[PDB]
């Protein structure tokens, strides 16, 4: 498919996205399962089904669910994602 960087401002609200998957949870990776319709992730271009590859430059391709959660919560948030 295609890889995009998506940068979100860290303005203190929710990101407005949900993830599933992880190396402990067949199709491998951490995926965006929900993007709240008017939230920051949606406005920023994130889409359901996107695979999170990297969080602020940190590789999460083979991360467990909880490892990816920790990276997301850790001034801007850079998400490298793959789609299609």
């Amino acid at each position: 498919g295609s890889v995009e960087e998506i940068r979100l401002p860290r303005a203190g609200g929710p990101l407005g996205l949900s993830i599933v998957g992880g190396s402990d949870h067949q199709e491998p990776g951490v995926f965006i399962s929900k993007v709240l319709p008017r939230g920051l992730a949606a406005r920023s271009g994130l889409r359901v089904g996107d695979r999170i590859l990297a969080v602020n430059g940190q590789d999460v391709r083979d991360a467990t669910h909880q490892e990816a959660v920790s990276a997301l919560l850790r001034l801007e948030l850079s998400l490298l994602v793959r789609r299609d």
Partner: peptide, 6 residues
């Protein structure tokens, strides 16, 4: 399995 909203 889980889904985590942030």
């Amino acid at each position: 399995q889980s889904e985590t909203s942030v």
